[PDB]
PDB file of C-alpha atoms in Angstrom:
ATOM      1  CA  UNK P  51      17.078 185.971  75.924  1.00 24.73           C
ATOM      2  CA  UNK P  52      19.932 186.643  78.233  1.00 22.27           C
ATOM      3  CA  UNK P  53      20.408 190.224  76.781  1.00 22.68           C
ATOM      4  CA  UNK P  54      16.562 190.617  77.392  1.00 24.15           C
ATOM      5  CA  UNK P  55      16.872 189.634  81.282  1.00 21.56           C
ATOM      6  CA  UNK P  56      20.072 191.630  81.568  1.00 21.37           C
ATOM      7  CA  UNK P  57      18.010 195.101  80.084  1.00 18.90           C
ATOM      8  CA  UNK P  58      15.659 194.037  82.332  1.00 19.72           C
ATOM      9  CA  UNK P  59      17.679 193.984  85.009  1.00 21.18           C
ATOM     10  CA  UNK P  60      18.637 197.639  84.765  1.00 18.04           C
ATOM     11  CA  UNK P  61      15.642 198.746  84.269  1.00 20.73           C
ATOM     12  CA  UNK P  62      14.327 197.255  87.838  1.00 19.87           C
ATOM     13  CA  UNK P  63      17.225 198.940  89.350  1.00 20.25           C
ATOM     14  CA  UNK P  64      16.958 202.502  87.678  1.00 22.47           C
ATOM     15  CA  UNK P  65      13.162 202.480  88.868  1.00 23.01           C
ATOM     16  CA  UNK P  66      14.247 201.426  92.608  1.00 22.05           C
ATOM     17  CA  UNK P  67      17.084 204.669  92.271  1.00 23.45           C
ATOM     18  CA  UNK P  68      14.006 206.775  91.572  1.00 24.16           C
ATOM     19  CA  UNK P  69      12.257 205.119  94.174  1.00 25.50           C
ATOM     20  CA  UNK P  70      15.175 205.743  96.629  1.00 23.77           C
ATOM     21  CA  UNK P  71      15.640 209.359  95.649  1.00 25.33           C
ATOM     22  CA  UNK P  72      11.920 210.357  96.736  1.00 29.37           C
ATOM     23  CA  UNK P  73      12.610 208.719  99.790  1.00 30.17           C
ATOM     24  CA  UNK P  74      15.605 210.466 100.594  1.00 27.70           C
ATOM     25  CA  UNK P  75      14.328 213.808  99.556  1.00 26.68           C
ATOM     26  CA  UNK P  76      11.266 212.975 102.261  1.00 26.50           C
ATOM     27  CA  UNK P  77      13.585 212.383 104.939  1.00 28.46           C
ATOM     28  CA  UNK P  78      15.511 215.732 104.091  1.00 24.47           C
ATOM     29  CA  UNK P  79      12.019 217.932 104.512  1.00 22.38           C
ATOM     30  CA  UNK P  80      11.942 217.469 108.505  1.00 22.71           C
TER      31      UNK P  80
ATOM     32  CA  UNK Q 119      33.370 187.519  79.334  1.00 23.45           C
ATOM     33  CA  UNK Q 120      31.927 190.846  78.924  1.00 22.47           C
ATOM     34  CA  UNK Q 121      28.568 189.232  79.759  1.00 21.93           C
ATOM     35  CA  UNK Q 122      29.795 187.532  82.843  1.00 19.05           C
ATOM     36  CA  UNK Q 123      31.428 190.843  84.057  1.00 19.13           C
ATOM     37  CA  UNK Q 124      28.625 192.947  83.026  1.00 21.11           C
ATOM     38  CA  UNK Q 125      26.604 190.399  85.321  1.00 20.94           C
ATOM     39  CA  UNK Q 126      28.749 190.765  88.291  1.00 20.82           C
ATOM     40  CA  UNK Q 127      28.195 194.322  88.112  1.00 22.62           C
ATOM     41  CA  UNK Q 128      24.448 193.742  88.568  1.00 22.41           C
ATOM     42  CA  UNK Q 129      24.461 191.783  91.102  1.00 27.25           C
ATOM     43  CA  UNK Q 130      27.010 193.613  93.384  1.00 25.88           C
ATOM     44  CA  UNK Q 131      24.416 196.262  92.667  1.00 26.23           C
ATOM     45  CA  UNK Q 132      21.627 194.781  93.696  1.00 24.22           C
ATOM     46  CA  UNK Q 133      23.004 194.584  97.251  1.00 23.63           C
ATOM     47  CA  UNK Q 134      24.553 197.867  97.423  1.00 24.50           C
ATOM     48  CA  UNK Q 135      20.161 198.523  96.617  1.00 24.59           C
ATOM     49  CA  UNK Q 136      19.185 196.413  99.252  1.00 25.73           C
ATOM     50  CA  UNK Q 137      21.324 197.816 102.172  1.00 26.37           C
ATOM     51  CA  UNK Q 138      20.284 201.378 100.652  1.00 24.04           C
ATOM     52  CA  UNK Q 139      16.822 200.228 101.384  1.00 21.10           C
ATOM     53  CA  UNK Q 140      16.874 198.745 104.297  1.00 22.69           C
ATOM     54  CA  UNK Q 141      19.058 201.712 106.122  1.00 25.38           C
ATOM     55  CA  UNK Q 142      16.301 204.041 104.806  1.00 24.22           C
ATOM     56  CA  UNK Q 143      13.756 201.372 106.930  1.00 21.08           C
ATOM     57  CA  UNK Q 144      15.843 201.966 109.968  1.00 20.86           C
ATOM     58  CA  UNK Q 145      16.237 205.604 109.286  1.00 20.44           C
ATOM     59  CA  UNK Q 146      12.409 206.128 109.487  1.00 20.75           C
ATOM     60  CA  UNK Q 147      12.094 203.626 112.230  1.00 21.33           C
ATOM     61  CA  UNK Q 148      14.775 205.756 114.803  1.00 18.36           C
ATOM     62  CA  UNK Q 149      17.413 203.362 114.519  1.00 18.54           C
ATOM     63  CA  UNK Q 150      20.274 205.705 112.639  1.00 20.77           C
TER      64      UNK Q 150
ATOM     65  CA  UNK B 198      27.970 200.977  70.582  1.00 19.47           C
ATOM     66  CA  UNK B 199      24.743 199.242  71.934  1.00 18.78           C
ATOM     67  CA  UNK B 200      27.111 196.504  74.636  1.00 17.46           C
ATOM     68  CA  UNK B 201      28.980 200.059  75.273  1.00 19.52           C
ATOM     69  CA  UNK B 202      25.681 202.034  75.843  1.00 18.01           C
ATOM     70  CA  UNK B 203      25.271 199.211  78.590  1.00 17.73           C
ATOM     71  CA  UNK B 204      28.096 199.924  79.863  1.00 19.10           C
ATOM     72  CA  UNK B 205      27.445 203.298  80.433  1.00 16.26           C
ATOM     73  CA  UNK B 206      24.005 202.726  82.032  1.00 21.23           C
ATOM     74  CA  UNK B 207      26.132 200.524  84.705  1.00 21.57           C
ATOM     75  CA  UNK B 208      28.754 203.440  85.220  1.00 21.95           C
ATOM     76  CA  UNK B 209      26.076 206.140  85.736  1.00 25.17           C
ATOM     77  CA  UNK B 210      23.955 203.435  88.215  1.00 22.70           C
ATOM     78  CA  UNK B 211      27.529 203.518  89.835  1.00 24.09           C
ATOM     79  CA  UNK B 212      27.831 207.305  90.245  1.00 21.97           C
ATOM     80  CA  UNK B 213      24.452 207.203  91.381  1.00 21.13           C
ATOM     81  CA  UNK B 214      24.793 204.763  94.182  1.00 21.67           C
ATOM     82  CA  UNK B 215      27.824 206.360  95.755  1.00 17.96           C
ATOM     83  CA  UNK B 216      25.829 209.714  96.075  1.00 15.79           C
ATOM     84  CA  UNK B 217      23.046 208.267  97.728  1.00 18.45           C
ATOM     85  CA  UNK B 218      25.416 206.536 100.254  1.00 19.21           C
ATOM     86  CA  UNK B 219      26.926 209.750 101.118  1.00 18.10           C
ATOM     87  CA  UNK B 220      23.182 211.509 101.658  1.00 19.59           C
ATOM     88  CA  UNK B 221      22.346 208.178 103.552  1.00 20.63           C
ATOM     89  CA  UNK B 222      25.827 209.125 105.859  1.00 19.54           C
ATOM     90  CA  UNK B 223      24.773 212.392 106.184  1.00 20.35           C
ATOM     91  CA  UNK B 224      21.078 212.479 107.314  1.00 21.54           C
ATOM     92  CA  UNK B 225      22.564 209.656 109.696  1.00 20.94           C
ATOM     93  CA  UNK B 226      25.559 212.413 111.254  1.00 20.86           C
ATOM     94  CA  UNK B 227      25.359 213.244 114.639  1.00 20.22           C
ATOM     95  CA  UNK B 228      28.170 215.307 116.716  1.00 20.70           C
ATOM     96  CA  UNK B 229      30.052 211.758 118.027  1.00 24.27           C
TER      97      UNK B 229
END
């Protein structure tokens, strides 16, 4: 249950790294 | 143990995502 | 291998973090 959470975890945070690395790639084109 | 540590990791991480966030918020707002 | 892989996925979210603060320091760079 705790390993489940954990995999969970870093699975949230590797989709908000995507997330972050469209943004920053947005504010580049300008 | 290795859990624990492996848990400390996270969360440290989880702010580093947050202030990476919110800096991008200011960025597009003028204020950086 | 599987706790290891883990810890791999934490090292590369690590990498990954400290590259994005640079680009976040250097869309912010003005002439000071």
């Amino acid at each position: 249950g705790e390993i489940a959470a954990i995999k969970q975890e870093i699975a949230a945070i590797k989709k908000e790294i995507a997330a972050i690395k469209f943004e920053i790639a947005a504010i580049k084109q300008g």
